[PDB]
Subunit: 98 residues, 10 copies
């Protein structure tokens, strides 16, 4: 997993502003990995009760992506600009728009 | 991470009833790992806005543990009995209930 | 494995209250992995004696899940609340109880 | 790394629409990891020229996040809704908008 | 962990006799790793209740070592002979018995 | 592998009593892994010379299991008791006597 | 991934001259891994819009290889010589040159 | 390591042209990792004989980077263009050439 | 570890001559790793009995290196030539023989 | 890979004599892994130019094994004796002499 075994944790000082941006990106990584995991599980579950819960949990992890992204964009103005630039590049090359 | 790179996925058959139990346990593993991760992040985040969201997300992951646990207990009657036995064992050794 | 090579262990101070909650979740992770491992081994073991022991050991690991979860719930009141909430959500969405 | 050693690639059929969503999330994972890597490197680089390139490359990886995100949102309408809902949740709990 | 993600399990045929010996050794590996994990956790746990349960679970994993060992020795006569030889080698070199 | 890259080793003090037990369990893990590796290799080697040596090396690793086990049992009296208890549990459930 | 979880970052000194070389090589590793990942994804994407973006991002990662290579060559004169020597060896053995 | 355990190799088809590019990039990855490894070892080796060999081997691994690079550039014309573009970008941003 | 979980072993055909060379190199890797592990353990073991067995086992693993090396050299004549060439290069650069 | 991310390197003291033996064994491990990697790549490369370079590089890694082995044997006298003992054991069991 991504969490650290407490036996190995010997950090005492709080995150710097830049490390705070990094743990937000890592939190998004964790959520995206969880979404992929549950979507994959749902694909092979012919038990409709298990599939329904897997898909509903995955939906809630997608909201977690939004929460961590809102914090990241607030702390990373460069990401705001480049996110818009990335959207524009996709539009120009493919026509896909929000 | 725990999810598989789709390039490597070649399975076609659906999960067996035994495999359904195993992915539910793996789903609980994933949630418990996420809780530890966000609780650790919150511990070192002095930005109170970031800490607040980390702890609120962690709270929602704890509910996900319950959802998967509920499905597992419904499909694993042995886990229901042994969960009770484990609770009783802790009570007899420590008094915690 | 999940245990640390002692060559790398240099921590000398005890777990904080929050770290105590994290090692209990990690202990549950270890037990859930062991259950999956032994249930998988039993599936492919045509030796009935080996299968019988694998399933009996797995049963005892399921009790270990209960023991660690009893401690976790005692130290994590939020997990108690969210566990019930998770059970209720599955009930509302699937009827499973 | 995240890429597969071609020696292990036996897949011959194209990604399903569900797998397409998954590789887009994995691409975002790869970009976010690269940003963290280069931002961390720049922190410890006293060589001003190396730092400047590290930060400029990281900036360009942030645009890649946007490109993959645009594709993901176009194929994952649920993510569009939950992204909005996630933004609103942060705004309510912290005022960040 | 050591258990396989069911998404990746495509084996259908049962373990051979030689593979049965290998999974028993792997089961012993899993138990020994769990013992080390729980013994390490107990070392840093000031909560006497958590320490008591950690040590009692670890004790039960030591019994699992015996169960898997008994099956392995029953299926691996070479291991029986070499176990004795290993005990004797330690005797001649250290006096430990 | 299981060994540590010396670049990362910064420990100076010797193993405690419990750490000595843990490295003995880790040594057994390494031996059992090596046995499985060489038995697997021998299974697919139709070169009789390679197979013969793989099986002979594997036999000697099984003796290493005994050596590390002897030290572990001498330092871990709880393991002595539970090992006997484990054998009896197998006997009660299957009749096997190893 | 290759980035470190900030929870484990306890380094305070800046990189030495030799370490600067090593992180530039690691940056090239990260870029080459990303190129392989996106090229592999593009191979199995039947969605032409997705494939188009994957290939364009991969192209931009190839430019990042050049950026990190330029810095590395400026700091590693031995790499300059051996790069030329490596090019020459391929010439003599295969005739490939450019 | 990066090499595959032959027990797991079941591929029969030769590499495609795309896969050939990918294994060349992976070969470069292996060489760059070896260079970092030996450079790190040499830094902490007080034995001047060991240091001398480590640096001489690392020098030869740097030539291997050139060999694999030459093949890659010959098969990946896009990499030729972007390599020059990357050089130019560094010149514009830092003055390095 | 280096051994494969039998659940994942789907191979049915024997090793090719090239694969035999590769598993011999992998066997040497396993032995060298074991030597480093036990040599490291012996370093921090003030229990003289434990140290004495660790060093004696490590000695026996060093003989295993020779056994696998003899087979490798017998199947890899190129390695014989390059081994001697490597010895001569060290002699030329350091005088060690 | 086997190299350490410099962000995690905090050792400020040279290798002991025992650690020097360990990094030489680790260097041999790295070379043997590279040989296996390049031998495997050459197996699937029907491009004869790429195959030729893969095999020639692999040949040079085999010389690196010899260089590191020479240093190890010079610093590890037990390995010299046990290497001879291993060769003799193989000759006894198979008749192979190397
Ligand atoms: Fe989540
Ligand atoms: Fe969750
Ligand atoms: Fe257990
Ligand atoms: Fe990118
Ligand atoms: Fe157990
Ligand atoms: Fe051994
Ligand atoms: Fe890039
Ligand atoms: Fe090389
Ligand atoms: Fe050995
Ligand atoms: Fe080399």
């Amino acid at each position: 997993g991504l969490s650290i075994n407490p036996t190995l944790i010997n950090r005492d000082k709080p995150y710097t502003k830049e490390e705070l941006m990094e743990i937000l990106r890592l939190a998004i990584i964790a959520e995206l990995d969880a979404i992929n995991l549950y979507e994959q599980m749902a694909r092979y579950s012919e038990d409709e009760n298990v599939r329904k819960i897997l898909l509903d949990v995955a939906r809630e992890e997608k909201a977690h992506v939004g929460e961590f992204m809102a914090l990241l964009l607030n702390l990373d103005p460069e990401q705001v600009t480049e996110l818009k630039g990335g959207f524009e590049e996709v539009k120009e090359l493919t026509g896909i728009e929000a």
